[PDB]
Swiss-Prot record, chain A:
PANTHER family: GLUTATHIONE S-TRANSFERASE U23, GLUTATHIONE S-TRANSFERASE, GST, SUPERFAMILY, GST DOMAIN CONTAINING
Gene coding for it: GSTU23
Matches recorded under PROSITE patterns: GST_CTER, GST_NTER
Domain GST N-terminal: 1-79
Repeat in keyword set: no
Catalytic activities: RX + glutathione = an S-substituted glutathione + a halide anion + H(+)
Protein known as: Glutathione S-transferase U23
Amino acid sequence: EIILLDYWASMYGMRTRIALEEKKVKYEYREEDLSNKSPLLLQMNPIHKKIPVLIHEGKPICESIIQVQYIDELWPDTNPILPSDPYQRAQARFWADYIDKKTYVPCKALWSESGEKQEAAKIEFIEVLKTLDSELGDKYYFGGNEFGLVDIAFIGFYSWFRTYEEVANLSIVLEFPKLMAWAQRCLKRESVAKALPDSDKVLKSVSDHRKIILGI
Amino acid sequence: EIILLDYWASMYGMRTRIALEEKKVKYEYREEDLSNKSPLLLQMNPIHKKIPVLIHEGKPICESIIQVQYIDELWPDTNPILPSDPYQRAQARFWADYIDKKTYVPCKALWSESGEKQEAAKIEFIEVLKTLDSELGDKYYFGGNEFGLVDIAFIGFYSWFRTYEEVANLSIVLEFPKLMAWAQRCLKRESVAKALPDSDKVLKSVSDHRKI
Ligand SMILES: [Mg+2]
Ligand SMILES: [Mg+2]
């Protein structure tokens, strides 16, 4: 029994959706209402009370990158996610940690705010894009020749690029062609295609939120 | 060849010192001047430009919990740090992540700030202590019956407890006897005793810093 408590537009939740599909395991997806958290969510993640929460045989695993590693360790011989070499594994973890640190808090403001908070977030996210663009270099994947941990860690953001361009006046698609080509590569995988929502859907939802909540 | 670029009072650097000693590997420790970062530190950690940096055969590994895992994966059969069970390993990673997230900012503020910022830091750190005390429960170690990753992740903070008490007017020693007993347990390991600086030394350094 595997249950995933998640929110459709969460790029962090998408990571775990992708990991599960890479391993071809059957699981139950449960959509959470962020304004009305389920008792199960509160019971399983009492410390943070956030999605995604992975429940395996009644036991919770919290934090998306920890979930992905857990899934890779349980089914290591089916579409291995992490590298086998300890140094390369450390580098994968580093870049996944980088993405989390630079985006989870300082980038929610990209769509949920206007004014100075949004402006600060724009500067931060453009720096993230430049840094990852440089890290990718001319490789097919962040994992080198094969799809890996860091690819999973960032690909969900692709479904938000059009939103960031429209609500935060960012230029992403035309400015980072290497990243766009990388995303198109990843999108061909069934796990990724299944996990990522349509970009127009994300945009409509965020626009509606901004109109209703921010009056913008 | 193993080089560790570190700062003596960094509780994050202490983690990697402890892991290295747990594996009994020989390494070169290099003390960094935080106000004058070496060219080697900037070359090896261009993204964050912070200590600790572990250099192994000329290749950098950054971030202390990633360093500890790296060390454990290179020498897994000598004093294993992480659990062998994947679920237990996920929980260890969770609590190490919790510690990093909740402390990295509000513990700098404990000693480097005053006023509302320091008061806010005090509330956050007391919450951390209560949460970890609850998680430890009646176990000998965060790792259960044996010293493990989460123990390594938090034990360096012990060397700062006196500082937090004195500069932030916190009560820790009298309020968390289970955590105090846990720290005494950890201190019996040579790796931990070697890594943790004297509590009074940390306080003097911080006091001088606050004045100047
Ligand atoms: Mg690979
Ligand atoms: Mg153990």
